[model samples]
Target: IREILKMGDERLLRIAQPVPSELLGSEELQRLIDDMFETMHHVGGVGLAAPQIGVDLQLVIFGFERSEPAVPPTILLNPRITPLDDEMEEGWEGCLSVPGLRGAVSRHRRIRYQGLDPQGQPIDRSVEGFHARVVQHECDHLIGRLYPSRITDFSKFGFTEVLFPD
Candidate 1:
């Protein structure tokens, strides 16, 4: 499994590079994608970005649960996201890159994202709710930002276990 970088990792602040068209379908890229999925699944994260694991490429993998135990895993390479409107939402979220902490982050309630798939084919998606939140979070990584950076209030940030002890 790849090591998910934490908040203190300097690489997290570096913007990720776009995957080259030629490399999009390469074996190495495919391997990295597989590794990314394995890492995300093992961590119970809904999404993961390349930069989070020190791979400086613009790639993200996420699974939005259409129903429990089944998913159409989403992959976006060099994604460009636009807020669908002025709508805003606040949601509690955690990250493998920022482990042990949960924070309330505000994001666009709806979004339209476009990018290339593993095969270098164009893909687009329009989504809302948790799907939008997950996309925004992972895309932030591509731009050298984190969910905590989007949080304007420090009061809403804290340890996950303490904040949600069950």
Candidate 2:
């Protein structure tokens, strides 16, 4: 689990590269996946993307926050997201990469996504609530976007400590 790169890193602003098929089964990729889940858990985050750790690959692991997170973290490789409806939901979002900051981000209420699992098997599903939000947030990393960028109201953005006191 590497330290997540914070905002302002140029890498976070560029599109991540799609993972090569050959690398899927490699020990390095498996370790990278393990590290991603470990890192996100250690930092108390719901999700993480490869680019967030400077890998620049279109890979993400998520679901442990308020859902049954895939054990060892479910790997999403080059995911393609599709909204299930026009409904929108706003929720507090924090990132391991951003650190100490949280914002009200608007996300689709439901989404259907298609992607390859770490084992190169197809994964397709439709989900709602936090699951949907998590998926969208992680997917944004593939195209150089962040939760803050999706915050419609600056008043809704602030430090996590101030926003969510311990």
Candidate 3:
């Protein structure tokens, strides 16, 4: 499993690079994607990006089975996101990099995200709610952004234990 980089790691602050077009469906790239999947699942996270594991590539994998509107595990390469509307919603967000801390971040309520699949095929999805949130959250890593940075209210940020208290 790849080691997940934490918040303090300077590498996490640098913008990620896109996977070379020629390498889109290459076995090597697929292996790296698989490794990301394994690492994310091991940590029980819903999504993961290559940068989170110290890779500089703009690749993200996300999906959750037991949740509503279930999303099949997907690998997005060189993703581009466009907000479908001005509507924004504040929701509790936590990252594997910033483990244990949950913050309320405002995200676009609907977005049209475009990217390439492992086969170098186009993936264009207009999503909302949790799916839209997940895409934005994971794609943020590509631009050197972490969820906490998007939080405008400090009062809504705290440790998971204190916030959930379950």
Candidate 4:
């Protein structure tokens, strides 16, 4: 499994490069994708980005079998997301990079994300709710931004165990 970079890692702060067309479906790219899925699952994350693992490529994988409405496992390369409207929703988010920290961030309620699949074929989807949130969270890594960067109220950010004591 690949090492998921944590907060304070300079590599996670750098913008990711787009995967070249020729690189799609390459054995190395395929291997990296598999490793990302394995790492994310091992850490119990809903999504993962290439940069989160110190890869410089604009790639993301997300989805879960038990998630409501069930987003199938997906791979997106060089994703471009556009908000469908001004509508926004606030949600609690945690990341593998940030570990125990959980924070509330406002995100577009609906968005249309366009990108290429592993085969270099175009993929476009318009989604809302958890799907939109997951996509936005993963995409932020491509631009060198983390969920915490979008949080406007520090009061809503803290250690998950403290905020949701069991």
> Number of the top candidate by lDDT?
4
Give the clash total for candidate 2.
0
Residues 1-166, candidate 2, lDDT per residue (tens digit)? 6878899999898799989999877898899998888888888777899999999898998866344334234689989999989999988898877878989988999999889987788999888887888889999998999888899988989998798798
For candidate 1, the lDDT comes to 0.88
When sorted by lDDT, best at the front, the candidate numbers are 4, 3, 1, 2
TM-scores, each model vs. reference: 0.94, 0.92, 0.96, 0.96
Better of 1 and 4 by lDDT: 4
Which residue pairs clash within candidate 2? none
Per-residue lDDT of model 4, residues 15-82, tens digit only: 99999999988999999998999898898888999998899999999997772456778999999999
Candidate 3 structure, TM-score to reference = 0.96
* lDDT tens digits by residue: candidate 3, 1-166: 8999999898888799988999977999978988998899899999998999999998999998983467668899989999988999989899999998999999999999999998889999999988999999999999889998899999999999999999
Residue 1, candidate 2: Cα error in Å is 2.5
> Whole-model Cα lDDT per candidate?
0.88, 0.86, 0.91, 0.93
RMSD of 2: 2.4
After superposing candidate 3, which stretches have Cα over 4 Å from the reference? Answer: 67-69
Distance from true location, Cα of 156 in model 4, Å: 1.0
Residue 60 lDDT in model 1? Answer: 93
Give the per-residue lDDT of model 1 (tens digit) for 133-162: 888999999989988889977798999888
